[PDB]
Symmetry: none
Subunit: 127 residues, 14 copies
């Protein structure tokens, strides 16, 4: 889940370690090996650090109490519904469905059958 964690950069998360400690802080960096860097983090003992560099071998799991919106995931779901018609545009963080429908994190822009199936997907997706 490197991709999903990349969507949480800048958001608060909790990382539970095999030595029993739990650090909560802003997700600062994630790499392919799942090493993690937290910013302005703290542990249960209430200790605070500008940065905590966490070795991936000791990470049990990472928790988020935040529902955020990931348009790449929406694009994955949209491909199942409009196969061959979906493009994620990292430049504007939008998902294009054909060349007349545009989905952003606020919703679907466009008209007709496609746009209505899309609106329906987006709504499911938001839940």
């Amino acid at each position: 889940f490197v991709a999903e964690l990349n969507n949480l950069l800048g958001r608060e998360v909790q990382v539970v370690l095999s030595n029993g400690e739990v650090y909560k802080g802003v997700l600062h960096a994630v790499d392919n090996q799942l090493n993690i860097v937290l910013a302005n983090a703290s542990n249960k003992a209430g200790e605070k650090f500008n940065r905590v560099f966490i070795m991936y071998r000791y990470i049990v799991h990472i928790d988020s109490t935040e529902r955020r919106i990931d348009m790449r995931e929406f694009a994955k779901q949209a491909e199942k519904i409009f196969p061959g018609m979906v493009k994620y545009i990292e430049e504007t963080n939008v998902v294009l469905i054909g060349d007349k429908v545009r989905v952003s994190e606020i919703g679907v822009e466009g008209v007709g059958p496609v746009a209505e199936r899309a609106k329906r997907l987006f709504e499911e997706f938001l839940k």
Copy 2:
């Protein structure tokens, strides 16, 4: 068992970790290395999280208390009974036996010896 778990996506499962914690939630994603992502999960202390990202190295086992029919598994089993005549169709989630027998999650469709043998097999498949 990446395949088996993929059939449980969207269903509730329980994941027991080596640090003694147990998470229960909706199986949200599974990769080839078996890292797991649960949605709306909780541990035994009652804490809840929108997402829990579980590193595969600390997962002891994953448990399910649900039946859940897997037509790919039925296809594998049918292949042993009707060698060379079995095809799984992911598009409609059905299994074709020969040119005239069709088996969906609700059962066998067809007539004759083949259909009777498939019906016996489908029934035992549901254990």
Copy 3:
């Protein structure tokens, strides 16, 4: 992609090996390590084998061998089955039948006798 492949059991795939051989046959089994078993396969020299067990270390890539269904044709044949209720939306290459059934090149959306009849039509194309 163990899960995506497992969804192709019984379908014909091509496996390109790093020794330059190319084997085409029915996908019989895939494991977590991506070892692959092909049933009734053949190589470029035209030799045929009932079963081929492929070590994952030598697999360069696996390719789909079937063209997706022609949705304009699907609409053509479907209009005859559901007169006055078929529509082909060129915008997303999708076919709508009535107002509760939707067909894309990867499947049939909806439930009911029309949904069901459309899955049989779709499967017929696949054969």
Copy 4:
């Protein structure tokens, strides 16, 4: 596929190696790592060896060498043994014997003396 290969012990297989050699012989042993031992194997140059211990790292693929049984001929021979009790079903290429025995190109289903006799017939096709 350790399990599937273990089910072929004593059967003839072909093993393609990444140095271009190809050995055909009786599958003698398979281990978890997929190291393979063949008995009375030979290569394309015609050299013959009582045993060949093949390192898993150089195995590209292992292939079956036997063709599946001709079910119509099986049906013909079963007919002589169970007069009037045999039915060939083209729809799946299966042969039915009486009301309790079913034979596919992969084996005999059923129990009892007819099933036992059918297995024996099946095996006679494999020895050829």
Copy 5:
């Protein structure tokens, strides 16, 4: 022992884990890496689960209290006594020794010295 475990598919086994849990259930699946799936399993705390997917890293040992004839093993033992004349036949679960003796899980069938030597071997084999 992937091959031995395969001979126990559908049979009840006990799996002792590193975390101290012990699950008993029907051996439903085993792969090359020795991950294990039990069906209808229960632990020492009495909980029952339809499926338990156990990660190989945490399995200490697998135990069986049943005697289960494995004709593949008999074939291996026969090969040391009748070198070059043995063949396990998966299609019927029989071991052929030479051209005229056949051995099933019920015992030896045949006539002569070969049958006699095989009879003694099968008796030793049963214990």
Copy 6:
């Protein structure tokens, strides 16, 4: 670069393999180990496949296939949509529109209607 590649989902990429083949197609999926799935991909011999599942051990490199947008042209067109508001800055190859919307070859900064209309022009260049 799992995260960077995930950001190209649905865009066309080129994947060069160690056996000499090169597959061009839309990135359909990328996992942590960098196995890649391409959709409607084709190779140099011209063969096309609806899906190509590429094993990570054999991937040498993955290349972007799209050229970046010509900012000078973007500027020209933004003007005939935002007269007297467009300014192309050579110093950074950036185009400014009004006083609160900035556009580079990888995005538009800003909020509000002018920022939104600009993302749409950007998207139009991307579509072709």
Copy 7:
């Protein structure tokens, strides 16, 4: 996080080990495998050592309470804002943006919109 740590060479850090010890000292050396050498480091019991060579397998996490500026990190995020016009200059530890704006750990030097934009980024960078 080999890169981030490298920026902390000469600075005081705390390294938490899986045997329960915690060493605080100057980060003297870090390699690609994340082995770490600390200088004049002490553990909680109060023992100090001129050098402590810590094996990466036993490192849970590294923590820093300082806010050290990394012009490399500034250059990475400057590249997201001025794609293709950002160069980090190890020789003088400065980031060049175009041919007339230059950012040091002190701040932005240059004028016009580029300078202004950079000033906004550098200032944010300082959080």
Copy 8:
């Protein structure tokens, strides 16, 4: 197959390497990683070395170099030694001696004088 090779210490074996070389010599040592030491070994170019230490990573396969014993010839010679007590059995290519000794191409079953004499004839055949 470390156990199997360890049973060939002192016997002549052929080791095919991924660089194209083939060394045949006496198996001197095998470890669990299947590194192999041959003594008095030679390659195809005819070079001979008193010891060759082969790294497991480059080993493709290891082959037996001896043919199994001619059992009909063994029976002919056991017959001179045990008048009217020897019988070759073609069904399994085994030689029976008296009622308590049995010889396959892999060894002798039985205990006592006849068995011990049978083992020495077998060995004489291996030394040829």
Copy 9:
């Protein structure tokens, strides 16, 4: 020690696991990765199992209280004393030294200097 353990097949051994359990049974199977299968085994709590399939990663050590003659071992040793003249014959479990001296589990058969040196070696071996 895959080869030494193979010599103990069919013999009783003890396997100590890192979870603290200790199983005692007949060594039934051992593979190159040192996974071990025990037959008729039992643990310190008295529980009996027809088969115990032990994963190599949890095995600390394996113990044997029996002295068991391994002729391949004698062959390794004989090779140091009679370089180039030694061969282990698996077919008969015998070690041949030169072509007139034969050593089995019960001893040296042959005459002359070679046989005398082999007897001394075999005696030491046991």
Copy 10:
């Protein structure tokens, strides 16, 4: 050498791959595994790509492509900015400027107005 390469972000480099290709472009990113992202890179056939994601397993070596600054020419241009305060030292190929500013081919040592001004001159050599 993850740290050494991270210090080269934004600078031009060349990456040689075991498939024989060679890409030259601006170092865009380097991870702990030594996977490399090059921006605006081109291979030896002249093809160009906005981004090339290179898998570490296939990288033979990475080479710096810029020549170090010519220190004789640096002292020359520097005398013009710092009249009578510049000394070129043949012994170590270093340039002294005044009494507290030192310049080698890898940087400027010193602090204050002269040091600042000489870093900007060093930088201009690197810009061209």
Copy 11:
């Protein structure tokens, strides 16, 4: 830190193991995997051993209370000050800077500007 430990061969060090033992002794050997041999070692309980061979997998960290001069590290630092002009000479354990300046653990030999810069570096190195 294989290089650094080699500089400590023949000097006293302590090695802390993950089973809780601590051995103090003369560093006798270090290999690339960081296995370690100690001569005339002792543990906290006071037992003494001529040799203690320590498996690298169990070493948490190695510590030294001695300040040991390593001319190779001086050569590393000097190379940053006199790029392209530095050479470590193992035959004499000296660092040549240019053609007229020589540095030993005794000090800098030579005259001129280079020698003076080298002397500040050395006095600093001995910090």
Copy 12:
């Protein structure tokens, strides 16, 4: 330290395991992966075993109380003193220095400055 342990074959050593057991016995065999076989060993509880086969993953360290002479190690030391003139002779366990000096475990044979230097070397080696 496979080489150093080989020199101890036949000598008593102690092996400390991560489960806390300690075995003392004759070093019977050691392989490249450092698996160890002990002959006639005993543990702290006083149980004795003909053979103890110790998996390398569980070995923390191996200890020896004997001072044993390793002529190969002396050869490695002599090569630093007599570069290019040293040869270890496994056949007779001696070290040849040049053509006229021979060193066995009871000392130096030879006359002249080479013999004198080798004697100082050997005396130290013994310490």
Copy 13:
């Protein structure tokens, strides 16, 4: 075979590499991973290097290059030193000196003046 190799320190070996090169020289160092350092080594092209540090991953095999001592010649020369006390024994290719010293192609067994002297003759052959 780290232990067997460590017993050849100072002796000449040949190392065959997967890139096709072959280096022959004095075995200088060997570690647990079987990396090898050779002293005064040369390849087939005739180049010589004072030290060659060989990465284990590329080593196909290592071969001793010294032939074993001709024992008949050893016996001949031992007869000039121990008149009438030497017997060459063709049976095992061993040389007996008196009744307490025995010499094989790999060593001398025995204690005392005769044994010590035979060890020096043995070494004189190894030095040739």
Copy 14:
């Protein structure tokens, strides 16, 4: 051989890679995994780079490029520097100065001023 290479920092070495390239340059850095950085290196084609970062997986071997110092010539020069104090000992190719200082092709043994002077003569021989 991490430690042995770290002792060659600043010295010239040759690194042979498995893609067939051979780089010669100053050893700038070596890490525990044997990744290697060369400074001002060149390949056989004559291309040179101020820095080359070589990936350990492609390094076949690293070779010393300097010849050891001529000890006879060293002696002939230690003479005009230490009249009547120098003896060249052929038996080990060693040079003795006075009776407390000893030089081998690997370095100087001894302490005090005669030793220091010896070390500097030794370095003059090494320098070019």
